[PDB]
């Protein structure tokens, strides 16, 4: 037998929170949560299913809720609770600067080496934590990392996350070919080491300020390109030191890839001397009613 999952799933009354405005279209809202009987306001993102007249859609969102409730790490998104109105609502920590994909696209000109490499560290810590929790994300991508502040990012989108057991077996869907390990595209094998392949791609997105991997290459062709030994090119800002780490994440032998713990170490060494490891034009010259009882979710802790 495995260790029991004693995560608490918190049920919230719809009256505990206020939708302030729409971020995306079901529909994600920016809002505020007052925990019942506590003098605190918590900035939240409220993910509300549209119809939910789909029994299928409901399993998907509750699986997400299951996983986000069972994770507690500074570099992974946690659930504050769920609301069981007509439409099931996930309440989570608001990540006000949006996805790191949009953030690096929008801010190409203001992002220096210190921020890129620290991001690579934080995503490695997030991902190592999940590995410690025997969790395979299966959808790591710069779009699925959110920005709390420019100094603080979190892995999100646990919709595809599964427990390990090594090779996890899948059986269809709309899948992110350009981020996936070869063994995942060919045999639907997913491991922590398939997650290291997508970490690799995620880092290439950051280091290219959000370029599209294999842009203008049909997904049908990716498996053959990879089998032919082709990989994404060295980004302009990347020293061979940084690119060689990306390349090792894209080895065909899964056990020849680095471990998330090793990636933490290698990126931290690089983060102590960022301008040795990334070369960016103008790097040194770069900067990035009642709110009284507002507390960030990260300072809002309930008994464990
Ligand atoms: C890590 C919590 C989370 O996913 N929050 C979020 C989602 C969408 C927009 C903003 N914040
Ligand atoms: Cl699950
Ligand atoms: Cl560091
Ligand atoms: Cl409490």
Cβ 77 under 6 angstroms from ligand 1: yes
Q: Provide the β-strand partners of residue 294.
A: 41
Q: How far is the CA of 42 from the centre of ligand 4 (A)?
A: 14
- Cα 27 to Cα 89: distance, rounded to the nearest angstrom: 10
Ligand at minimal distance from the CA of 267 is: 3
Tell me the two tokens of residue 296. Answer: 């960030």
Report yes or no: 11 and 83 within 8 Å, Cβ to Cβ: yes
* Test site for ligand 1: of 21, 25, 28, most ligand atoms within 8 A of the Cβ: 28
90 Cβ below 6 A of ligand 1: no
Resolution in angstroms comes to: 2.2
Q: By CB neighbour count within 10 A (0-12 exposed, 13-18 middle, 19+ buried), where does 114 fall? A: middle
The residues carrying an active-site annotation are 139
Regarding the beta carbon of 83 and ligand 1, being less than 6 Å apart is answered no
Separation of 301 CA from ligand 2 center, angstroms?
24
**CB burial of residue 175 (10 Å; 0-12, 13-18, 19+):** middle
> How far does the centroid of ligand 2 lie from the alpha carbon of residue 56, in Å?
15
Handedness of CA 161, 166, 171, 172 (dihedral sign): positive
Euclidean distance between CA atoms 247 and 204, whole angstroms: 10
How was this entry determined? X-ray
Decide if 275 contacts 283 (C-beta within 8 A).
yes
Write the residue with the smallest CA distance to atom 1 of ligand 1. Answer: 77
Asked if residue 146 has its Cβ within 6 Å of ligand 1, the reply is: yes
Residue nearest to atom 2 of ligand 1 (CA): 77
The count of other CB atoms within 10 Å of the CB of residue 30 is: 16
Tokens of 282: 């103008």
What value, to the nearest 5°, has the Cα angle with vertex 290 and ends 82 and 293? Answer: 60
Torsions phi, psi for 89 (to 5 deg): -120, 125
Dihedral sign for Cα atoms in the order 75, 17, 25, 86? positive
Asked whether the beta carbons of 278 and 116 are under 8 A apart, the reply is yes
Residues listed for the chain: 304
* Residue found under tokens 């498996």: 223
Please tell me the distance from the alpha carbon of residue 240 to that of residue 247, in angstroms, as a whole number. Answer: 10
Centre a 10 Å sphere on the Cβ of residue 182 and count the other Cβ atoms it contains.
Answer: 18
**How many whole angstroms separate alpha carbon 127 and alpha carbon 196?**
9
- The residue written with tokens 């713990």 in the block is 261
CA 41 to chain centre: 25
How many CB atoms are closer than 10 A to CB 53? 10
- Give, rounded to a whole angstrom, the gap between the first and last alpha carbons of the chain: 22
The verdict on the CB of residue 80 being under 6 Å from ligand 1 is no
Going from the N-terminus, what domains does the chain have, and what CATH number goes with each? 14-94 (3.30.200.20), 100-283 (1.10.510.10)
Residue with token string 């729409």: 22
DSSP string, the chain: -PPP-----PBPPGGGEEEEEEEE--EEEEEEE--TTSS-BEEEEEEE-S----HHHHHHHHHHHHHHHS---TTB--EEEEEESSSEEEEEE--TT-BHHHHHHHTGGG--HHHHHHHHHHHHHHHHHHHHTTEE-S---GGGEEEEETTEEEE---TT-EE----B----SS--GGGS-HHHHHH--B-HHHHHHHHHHHHHHHHTTSPPTTTT--HHHHHHHHHTT------TTB-HHHHHHHHHTT-SSGGGSPPHHHHHHHHHHHHTSHHHHB--TTGGG------TTB--GGG-----
The verdict on the CB of residue 45 being under 6 Å from ligand 1 is yes
Torsion sign (Cα): 200, 259, 119, 246: negative
Q: Which pair of tokens denotes residue 215? A: 């842009």
Please state, in angstroms and rounded to a whole number, the distance separating the CA atoms of residues 90 and 48. Answer: 7
Ligand nearest to the CA of 96: 1
Separation of alpha carbons 247 and 95, rounded Å: 31
**Which of 159, 158, 150 lies closest to 206 in space, CA to CA?**
150
> What's the CA gap between 240 and 243, in Å, rounded?
5
The 3-class SS string of 99-167 reads EHHHHHHHCHHHCCHHHHHHHHHHHHHHHHHHHHCCEECCCCCHHHEEEEECCEEEECCCCCCEECCCC
Q: Could you say which ligand is closest to the alpha carbon of residue 62?
A: 2
């Amino acid at each position: 037998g495995e260790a029991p999952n004693q995560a608490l799933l918190r049920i919230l009354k719809e009256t505990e929170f206020k939708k302030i405005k729409v971020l995306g279209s079901g529909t994600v809202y920016k809002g505020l949560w007052i925990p019942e009987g506590e003098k605190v306001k918590i900035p939240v993102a409220i993910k509300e299913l549209r119809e939910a007249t789909s029994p299928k859609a409901n399993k998907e969102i509750l699986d997400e809720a299951y996983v986000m409730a069972s994770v507690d790490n500074p570099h992974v998104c946690r659930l504050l609770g769920i609301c069981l109105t007509s439409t099931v609502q996930l309440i989570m920590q608001l990540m006000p600067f949006g996805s790191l994909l949009d953030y690096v696209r929008e801010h190409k000109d203001n992002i220096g080496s210190q921020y890129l490499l620290n991001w690579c560290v934080q995503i490695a810590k997030g991902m190592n934590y999940l590995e410690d929790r025997r969790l395979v994300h299966r959808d790591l991508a710069a779009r699925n990392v959110l920005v709390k502040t420019p100094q603080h990012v979190k892995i999100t989108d646990f919709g595809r996350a599964k427990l390990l057991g090594a090779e996890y077996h899948a059986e269809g869907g709309k899948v992110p070919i350009k981020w996936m390990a070869l063994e995942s595209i060919l045999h639907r094998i997913y491991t922590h080491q398939s997650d290291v392949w997508s970490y690799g791609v995620t880092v290439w997105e950051l280091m290219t300020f959000g370029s599209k991997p294999y842009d203008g290459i049909p997904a049908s062709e990716i498996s053959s390109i990879l089998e032919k030994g082709e990989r994404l090119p060295q980004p302009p800002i990347c020293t061979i030191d940084v690119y060689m780490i990306m390349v090792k994440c894209w080895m065909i032998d899964a056990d020849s890839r680095p471990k998330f713990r090793e990636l933490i170490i290698e990126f931290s060494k690089m983060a102590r001397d960022p301008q040795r490891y990334l070369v960016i034009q103008g790097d040194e010259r770069m900067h990035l009613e009642d709110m009284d009882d507002v507390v960030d979710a990260d300072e809002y802790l309930i008994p464990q």
